[PDB]
């Protein structure tokens, strides 16, 4: 679900209302089991 | 006696100066408004 | 979006009648057509004013600080 990885802070569970005001991008993390 | 900024959610008169981060006393919510002017304003009542 | 004080058309006061009207509906279980006549709103210029208002202010209030 949406997250905001900003330096000087954790990673906030981002929300619409805020991404708009802050000019961020209401996106999220893409993870895949890379096997070697 | 006075104030300056505010927290969008946990509406709490806050404020500070340069390099004082841009967070709040509790709510991380890094938004912050800038509460009204003291110089009262007047209006045409029409 | 709050009841208009006075009707655009003739200017007859109507700011007060809001709450009264909302009752003549809910409580006194009447029909708009009559509730309006009850509040003394004669011609359509005054009628259309109340009958049509959309008290948005309420959804506004429901926000927070
Ligand atoms: Zn806060
Ligand atoms: Zn009228």
Swiss-Prot record, chain A:
Subunit annotation: Component of the RNA polymerase II (Pol II) complex consisting of 12 subunits.
Disulfide topology: none
Top-level taxon of the source organism: Eukaryota
Function as written in the Swiss-Prot or TrEMBL entry: DNA-dependent RNA polymerase catalyzes the transcription of DNA into RNA using the four ribonucleoside triphosphates as substrates. Second largest component of RNA polymerases II which synthesizes mRNA precursors and many functional non-coding RNAs. Proposed to contribute to the polymerase catalytic activity and forms the polymerase active center together with the largest subunit. Pol II is the central component of the basal RNA polymerase II transcription machinery.
Location of this fragment in the whole protein: 99 to 134 of 1224
Protein family: Belongs to the RNA polymerase beta chain family.
Protein name from the UniProt record: DNA-directed RNA polymerase II subunit RPB2
Additional detail: The binding of ribonucleoside triphosphate to the RNA polymerase II transcribing complex probably involves a two-step mechanism. The initial binding seems to occur at the entry (E) site and involves a magnesium ion coordinated by three conserved aspartate residues of the two largest RNA Pol II subunits.
Subcellular location: Nucleus
From Swiss-Prot, chain B:
GO MF, one annotated term: zinc ion binding
Keywords in alphabetical order: DNA-directed RNA polymerase, Metal-binding, Nucleus, Peroxisome, Ribosome biogenesis, Transcription, Zinc, Zinc-finger
Main location: nucleus
Start-end of C4-type zinc fingers: 7-27
GO biological process, one term: transcription initiation at RNA polymerase III promoter
Post-translational note: The N-terminus is blocked.
Domain of life: Eukaryota
Amino-acid positions noted as binding Zn(2+) in the UniProt annotation, renumbered to this chain: 7, 10, 24, 27
Keyword Zinc-finger in annotation: yes
Gene Ontology CC terms, in alphabetical order: cytoplasm; nucleolus; nucleoplasm; nucleus; peroxisome; RNA polymerase I complex; RNA polymerase II, core complex; RNA polymerase III complex
Cellular location(s): Nucleus, Nucleolus; Peroxisome
Function field: DNA-dependent RNA polymerases catalyze the transcription of DNA into RNA using the four ribonucleoside triphosphates as substrates. Common component of RNA polymerases I, II and III which synthesize ribosomal RNA precursors, mRNA precursors and many functional non-coding RNAs, and a small RNAs, such as 5S rRNA and tRNAs, respectively. RNA polymerases are composed of mobile elements that move relative to each other. In Pol II, the core element with the central large cleft comprises RPB3, RBP10, RPB11, RPB12 and regions of RPB1 and RPB2 forming the active center.
Note: Present with 907 molecules/cell in log phase SD medium.
Record text on subunit structure and interactions: Component of the RNA polymerase I (Pol I), RNA polymerase II (Pol II) and RNA polymerase III (Pol III) complexes. Component of the RNA polymerase I (Pol I) complex consisting of 14 subunits: RPA135, RPA190, RPC40, RPA14, RPB5, RPO26, RPA43, RPB8, RPA12, RPB10, RPC19, RPC10, RPA49 and RPA34. The complex is composed of a horseshoe-shaped core containing ten subunits (RPA135, RPA190, RPB5, RPO26, RPB8, RPB10, RPC10, RPA12, RPC19 and RPC40) where RPA135 and RPA190 form the DNA-binding cleft.
Family statement drawn from the similarity comment of this UniProt entry: Belongs to the archaeal Rpo12/eukaryotic RPC10 RNA polymerase subunit family.
Full protein segment contained here: 25 to 70 of 70
UniProtKB/Swiss-Prot annotation, chain C:
Family of the protein in this entry: Belongs to the archaeal Rpo10/eukaryotic RPB10 RNA polymerase subunit family.
Function: DNA-dependent RNA polymerases catalyze the transcription of DNA into RNA using the four ribonucleoside triphosphates as substrates. Common component of RNA polymerases I, II and III which synthesize ribosomal RNA precursors, mRNA precursors and many functional non-coding RNAs, and a small RNAs, such as 5S rRNA and tRNAs, respectively. Pol II is the central component of the basal RNA polymerase II transcription machinery. Pols are composed of mobile elements that move relative to each other. In Pol II, RBP10 is part of the core element with the central large cleft.
Gene name, Swiss-Prot/TrEMBL: RPB10
Keyword Transferase: no
Pfam families: RNA_pol_N (PF01194)
Oligomeric form and interacting partners: Component of the RNA polymerase I (Pol I), RNA polymerase II (Pol II) and RNA polymerase III (Pol III) complexes. Component of the RNA polymerase I (Pol I) complex consisting of 14 subunits: RPA135, RPA190, RPC40, RPA14, RPB5, RPO26, RPA43, RPB8, RPA12, RPB10, RPC19, RPC10, RPA49 and RPA34. The complex is composed of a horseshoe-shaped core containing ten subunits (RPA135, RPA190, RPB5, RPO26, RPB8, RPB10, RPC10, RPA12, RPC19 and RPC40) where RPA135 and RPA190 form the DNA-binding cleft.
Major subcellular site: nucleus
Cross-linked sites for Glycyl lysine isopeptide (Lys-Gly) (interchain with G-Cter in ubiquitin): 59
UniProt miscellaneous comment: Present with 5300 molecules/cell in log phase SD medium.
PANTHER family for the chain: DNA-DIRECTED RNA POLYMERASES I, II, AND III SUBUNIT RPABC5, DNA-DIRECTED RNA POLYMERASES I, II, AND III SUBUNIT RPABC5 FAMILY MEMBER
Protein name per its UniProtKB record: DNA-directed RNA polymerases I, II, and III subunit RPABC5
Keywords associated with the record: DNA-directed RNA polymerase, Isopeptide bond, Metal-binding, Nucleus, Ribosome biogenesis, Transcription, Ubl conjugation, Zinc
Ligand binding (Zn(2+)): 7, 10, 45-46
Molecular function as annotated in GO: DNA binding; DNA-directed RNA polymerase activity; zinc ion binding
Domain of life: Eukaryota
Keyword Zinc-finger attributed: no
PROSITE patterns linked: RNA_POL_N_8KD
């Amino acid at each position: 679900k949406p997250m905001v990885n900003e330096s000087d802070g954790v990673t906030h569970a981002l929300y619409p209302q805020e991404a708009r005001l802050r000019n961020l991008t209401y996106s999220s993390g893409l993870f895949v089991d890379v096997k070697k | 006696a006075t104030l300056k900024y505010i927290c969008a959610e946990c509406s709490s008169k806050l404020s500070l100066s340069r390099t004082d981060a841009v967070r709040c006393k509790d709510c991380g919510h890094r938004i912050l408004l800038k509460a009204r002017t003291k110089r009262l304003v007047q209006f045409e009542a029409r | 979006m709050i009841v208009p004080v006075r009707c655009f058309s003739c200017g007859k006061v109507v700011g007060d009648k809001w709450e009264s009207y909302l009752n003549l509906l809910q409580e006194d279980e009447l029909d708009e057509g009559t509730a309006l006549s009850r509040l003394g709103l004669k011609r359509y210029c005054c009628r259309r004013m109340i009958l049509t208002h959309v008290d948005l202010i309420e959804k506004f209030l429901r926000y927070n600080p």
